[PDB]
DNA sequence: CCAAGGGGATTACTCCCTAGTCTCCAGGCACGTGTCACATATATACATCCTGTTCCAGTGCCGGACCCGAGCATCCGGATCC
């Protein structure tokens, strides 16, 4: 009894947690591309059609332009999900 | 080969008798140094005084060992691109 849930269970695909991508893809519903099961960043939203080596450094942009203490926070967050990616699987 | 006694001899202290020479034998002199004298100088037992360093405390500091945590790198977990 570490974890009762285990609903991903992994096997070569799955998703982090079930529910901040779904947080991220309610989003995709609500606004105009209402996306099948993937769910991504914000920018999307702005431009659907998006690239790798294209789609990153924006986020990079926004990040130097926002504040250290958006920045912290963002350093405090997640660690929740640090926390909580070793239960279910109760190990690496 | 020496100790005792055989006779025979010049010396050297000893008598005789005089006399002139260092030495006892005492009333007086003004000296010579062994003792005396007040303190010296000499060697010794106490009380632990007071100083300034030089004998030491408290903590008037915080030196090493072991487990974590900051941000930029690469693996990996995820968008979705032909």
Do not use: W
């Amino acid at each position: 009894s570490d974890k009762a849930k285990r609903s991903p269970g992994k096997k070569k695909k799955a998703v982090r947690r079930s529910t901040s991508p779904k947080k991220a893809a309610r989003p995709r519903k609500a606004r105009s591309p209402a996306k099948k099961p993937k769910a991504t960043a914000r920018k999307a939203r702005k431009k659907s059609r998006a690239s790798p080596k294209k789609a990153k450094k924006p986020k990079t942009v926004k990040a130097k332009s926002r504040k250290a203490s958006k920045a912290k926070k963002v350093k405090r967050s997640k660690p929740r999900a640090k926390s909580g990616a070793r239960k279910s699987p109760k190990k690496k």
